[PDB]
Amino acid sequence: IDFSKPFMSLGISIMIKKPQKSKPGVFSFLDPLAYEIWMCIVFAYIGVS
Amino acid sequence: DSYSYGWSFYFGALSFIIAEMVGVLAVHMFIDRHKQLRATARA
Ligand SMILES: CCCCCCCCCCCCCCCC(=O)O
């Protein structure tokens, strides 16, 4: 058959799952340390006092 | 080795608080015992 001129140029692309904006949590300033450290600091604080 | 801590873990964490608070209350009783002795032995 004899095609006509392309009316839509395309190709092979890459599709991935759209990511999320990862809205920071309210209490995210605690993230640098683990929950165990934060809990142990309170225990250490009480003990020292 | 997701994990979580149970009540038995928090039973020893609560016991720590109760123990430190009892230790403080016992130290006050000791300071109270000696304060009375000093005050009685002053007048
Ligand atoms: C002076 C010693 C204590 C100073 C205050 C530190 C405040 C942090 C304690 C609360 C955070 C407990 C952690 C649970 C939340 C989490 O990180 O998942």
| Owner of token pair 């250490």 | A44
| Owner of token pair 């015992």 | B33
Nearest CA to ligand 1 atom 12: A38
Q: Which two tokens stand for residue A5?
A: 């001129």
Write out chain A residues lying below 8 Å of B16, CB-based.
43, 46
Whole-angstrom Cα distance, residue A41 to residue A47?
A: 10
| Owner of token pair 């225990």 | A43
Q: What is the rounded radius of gyration, in angstroms, for the C-alpha atoms of chain B?
A: 19
Phi and psi dihedrals of B40, rounded to 5? -65, -40
Q: What spacing in Å lies between the alpha carbon of B20 and ligand 1's midpoint?
A: 19
CA dihedral sign, ordered A8, A14, A16, A22: negative
Q: Which two tokens stand for residue A29?
A: 């300033």
Give one DSSP letter per residue of A11-44, joined into a string.
------------PPPTTGGGTTS-HHHHHHHHHH
A41 lines ligand 1 (CB under 6 A): yes
Nearest CA to ligand 1 atom 9: A38
